[PDB]
């Protein structure tokens, strides 16, 4: 029944309030998702002026209910099974040799629109690190979200790493720890171990003068 909400193109709204080492900011996003093709097209705007962290570090926080689950893996799709009431997605993101993000989001339908409401808290960041010093490249990254069942919370856990390219040629590692719990008390699909292969391509609207990010993302379930 949750899965039936995702058979076509769904409009998406994202709203994030963030505080990183006392720098407060807000991000608003709009776009659409097509889970048939695991395809997300979004545009994000920093509504408070200039973003105090690199756009790439926010991509993972800024809707895995749009993953393409192959037919033979459809019994493992927790994300869609929690809809429309939705789920809470929580993360800790450990930036190697730097600070950490803690995120809490509620992902749910408001009418026909899939809404992701986020609060992000960043602490222990270095003033001259890769994040607050804006030393990360703005291009493309890809990795696997390793998902396991969490039966006690009727939800899932996930772990993955993002290797953010640094401008000097190095790598800024971000270790992601994730938990998802349903908002409703209906039955949800608790999956076998598997992963989401995710590719994120970042670009700029040549006509947009506000601090912004255009995102083309593909998310595909695999490993069964």
Swiss-Prot record:
Changing residue 198 to H/W/F: Results in significantly red-shifted excitation and emission maxima. It comes from Aequorea victoria. The keyword tRNA processing does not apply. Pfam families: GFP. GO terms for biological process: bioluminescence; generation of precursor metabolites and energy. Changing residue 140 to F: In Sapphire/H9-40; exhibits a huge Stoke's shift, with an excitation peak at 399 nm and an emission peak at 511 nm. In Azurite; shifts the excitation and emission spectra to shorter wavelengths and increases quantum yields compared to BFP. Belongs to the GFP family. Changing residue 64 to M: In Citrinine; leads to excitation and emission peaks of 516 and 529 nm, respectively. Changing residue 198 to Y: Gives rise to yellow-emission variants. In EYFP; leads to yellow fluorescence, folds faster and more efficiently at 37 degrees Celsius and has superior solubility and brightness. Monomer. Photocytes. Green fluorescent protein has been engineered to produce a vast number of variously colored mutants, fusion proteins, and biosensors. Further generation of mutants led to more stable proteins (at 37 degrees Celsius for example) with brighter fluorescence and longer fluorescence lifetimes. Contains a chromophore consisting of modified amino acid residues. Maturation of the chromophore requires nothing other than molecular oxygen. Changing residue 193 to S: In EBFP1.2; shifts the excitation and emission spectra to shorter wavelengths and increases quantum yields compared to BFP. It comes from the Eukaryota. The gene is GFP. Changing residue 64 to L: In RSGFP4; increases fluorescence and shifts the major exitation peak to 489-490 nm. Keywords: Chromophore, Luminescence, Photoprotein. This is Green fluorescent protein. Energy-transfer acceptor. Its role is to transduce the blue chemiluminescence of the protein aequorin into green fluorescent light by energy transfer. Fluoresces in vivo upon receiving energy from the Ca(2+)-activated photoprotein aequorin. The keyword Ribonucleoprotein does not apply. Changing residue 140 to A: In Cerulean; leads to improved quantum yield, a higher extinction coefficient and is 2.5-fold brighter than ECFP.
């Amino acid at each position: 029944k949750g899965e039936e909400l995702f058979t076509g193109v769904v409009p998406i709204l994202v709203e994030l309030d963030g505080d990183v080492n006392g720098h407060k900011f807000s991000v608003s996003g709009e776009g659409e998702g097509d889970a048939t093709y695991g395809k997300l097209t979004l545009k994000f705007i920093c509504t408070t002026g200039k973003l105090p962290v690199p756009w790439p570090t926010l991509v993972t926080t800024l809707v895995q209910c749009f993953a393409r689950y192959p037919d033979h893996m459809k019994q493992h799709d927790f994300f869609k099974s929690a809809m429309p009431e939705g789920y809470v997605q929580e993360r800790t993101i450990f930036f190697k040799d730097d600070g950490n993000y803690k995120t809490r989001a509620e992902v749910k339908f408001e009418g026909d629109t899939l809404v992701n409401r986020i609060e992000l808290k960043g602490i222990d960041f270095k003033e001259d690190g890769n994040i607050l010093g804006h030393k990360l490249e703005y291009n493309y990254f890809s990795d696997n979200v390793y998902i396991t069942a969490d039966k006690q919370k009727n939800g899932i856990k996930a772990n993955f790493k993002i290797r953010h390219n640094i401008e000097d040629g190095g790598v800024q590692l971000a270790d992601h720890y994730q938990q998802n719990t349903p908002i409703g008390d209906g039955p949800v699909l608790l999956p076998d171990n598997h992963y989401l292969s995710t590719q994120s391509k970042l670009s700029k609207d040549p006509n947009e003068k506000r601090d912004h990010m255009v995102l083309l993302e593909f998310v595909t379930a695999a490993g069964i």
